Ligand binder design. Sequence first.
Ligand SMILES: COc1ccccc1-c1ccc(C(=O)O)o1
Length: 145
Amino acid sequence: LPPGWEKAMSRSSGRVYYFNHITNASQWERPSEPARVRCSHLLVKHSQSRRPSSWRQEKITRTKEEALELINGYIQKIKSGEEDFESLASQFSDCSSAKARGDLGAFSRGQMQKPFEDASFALRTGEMSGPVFTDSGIHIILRTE
Ligand SMILES: COc1ccccc1-c1ccc(C(=O)O)o1
């Protein structure tokens, strides 16, 4: 299995699934290192965020647990097809890259907080992460290239 992926048992179904410990992705199908990748993201900040402020809200007061909740709702809607990533990111991301549908352009290793970098480099093109925690808050990452 590609970097970070492991077999687990579903504790509802007892069906086998795969989870990734670097990106926090999880899925039923069996899964499948570039100099540069391109990613978008949807950030949800909380009161223990490095900077508890964003373009959406001068004072961010939601708890880390409430942030994780919002993130999990957005992941549910994205995975169900009910909203797309770009649209939730534009409305809801606490990063001002919300204005570009969450797009950050291409970067290589060396540039981002590590947990974000590692998640982005472990994603496959097209692939979306689970909740990824950094000092800025809780990220959903989409690898676009
Ligand atoms: C693309 O943005 C990030 C990637 C990794 C770690 C943090 C960030 C980020 C974007 C905006 C902010 C912040 O307001 O702290 O933090």
